[PDB]
Enzyme design. Structure first.
Site, mmCIF file in Angstrom:
data_model
loop_
_atom_site.group_PDB
_atom_site.id
_atom_site.type_symbol
_atom_site.label_atom_id
_atom_site.label_comp_id
_atom_site.label_asym_id
_atom_site.label_seq_id
_atom_site.Cartn_x
_atom_site.Cartn_y
_atom_site.Cartn_z
ATOM 1 C CD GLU A 1 1.710 -1.491 5.139
ATOM 2 O OE1 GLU A 1 2.461 -1.893 6.134
ATOM 3 O OE2 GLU A 1 1.476 -0.915 3.626
ATOM 4 C CB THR B 1 -0.896 -0.071 1.025
ATOM 5 O OG1 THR B 1 -1.660 -1.591 1.317
ATOM 6 C CG2 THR B 1 -1.493 1.194 1.055
ATOM 7 C CE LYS C 1 9.491 6.954 1.555
ATOM 8 N NZ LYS C 1 9.141 5.506 1.219
#
Lengths: 218, 218
Positions: free
Chosen positions: B102, B27, B120
């Protein structure tokens, strides 16, 4: 045991109630007796936090204020039974309807006073199926991992938790190291709560017997 | 733009998608690109397992059948983003509140493929607040324990998870030992899921940079 032994045990737990504190209250016949006892000390306590609607209703019937857990920062003690308790004071709980609520309240209490019947004492935890609360979508995944950990998970048919989750009762485990097992199950994605009170077990155990209440201290 | 880097990794992940398989889908804004990519293979894959309703809706619109996780006993791959990923390929996830689904799907998938833009990557996890999903009644209790663990929990106002829980975003931690911290938080009664994917991190990381997509293997 008999109701009289349970009554003796319930009232014996009153000696652990410190004035000015908030009391964590469990559920069951023995806990009900403790609530009667607690009513005699309504003047020395601020109130209580309850693990069930049954206990909440009785506490209120005796004029004791019942707090929501988020309203308190600490509980002097948590008085409740167990499905099993070993020699290391580690327990299996959750065979009933409120596993998660009970474990949460116990985590806020300074001392856990176990009032389980003598029949609940065991050497190796596991004979009684270990309850595991699981997110519905993860049921099969968690079950597969519980099998790899050596158990036989069985979906508790027709039951849902107050959190809308399902329960897998794990059969056949001989839990030699409850802490390691609790950690192993808590590590599984999808597991909400496992019925092993090992990292945080009982501090005192009050066992009813024909010759009086036996006190076992951690 | 940063979005083009996200698009690059989203489509680069298709290289790991084999015909006739069921794909685990994440997602978020980066996973969204992978979904667009999957659309070009709709008639070649068996289907997908989604970690959110938003992703499911997008998958369905692209003509991709979505299976419930309980319909499969395993998954070849799970492609998803991360809020942070360290050199040991451990991640912080849940910034978008879908951490529970998740983490559960990731526990079933054999290969976790993290897709993310260069921003990230971090050396020490923690700058991005660590999401912790908690049973509502345990919010204050869990927060107190998170403070003891060295963090500053912040209740995510106005948000509730798909499982009806609340989120405490933990600030100020320099998580030197992600596995130990993940275990410490999973040990807290009331915690449903912690956004640390450390015991099970990424197997492959596709990082979008100005010089192309960099592939990092476990």
């Amino acid at each position: 045991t008999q109701d009289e032994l349970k009554k003796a045990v319930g009232w014996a737990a009153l000696q652990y109630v410190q004035p000015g504190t908030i009391v964590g209250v469990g559920t069951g016949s023995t806990a009900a007796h403790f609530i009667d006892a607690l009513g005699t000390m309504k003047g020395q306590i601020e109130g209580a936090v309850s693990s069930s609607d049954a206990s909440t209703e009785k506490l209120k019937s005796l004029g004791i204020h019942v707090f929501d857990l988020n309203e308190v920062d600490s509980l002097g003690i948590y008085v409740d039974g167990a499905d099993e308790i070993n020699g290391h004071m580690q327990m299996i709980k959750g065979g009933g309807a409120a596993l998660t609520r009970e474990k949460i309240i116990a985590s806020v209490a300074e001392k856990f006073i176990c009032i389980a019947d003598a029949s609940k004492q065991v050497d190796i935890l596991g004979k009684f199926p270990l309850p595991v609360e699981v997110i519905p979508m993860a049921r099969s995944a968690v079950a597969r991992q519980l099998v790899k950990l050596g158990g036989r998970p069985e979906y508790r048919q027709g039951v849902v938790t107050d959190n809308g989750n399902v329960i897998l009762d794990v059969h056949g485990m001989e839990i030699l190291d409850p802490i390691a097992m609790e950690n192993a199950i808590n590590a599984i994605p999808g597991v909400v709560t496992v019925g092993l009170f090992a990292n945080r077990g009982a501090d005192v155990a009050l066992i009813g017997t024909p010759d009086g209440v036996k006190t076992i201290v951690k």
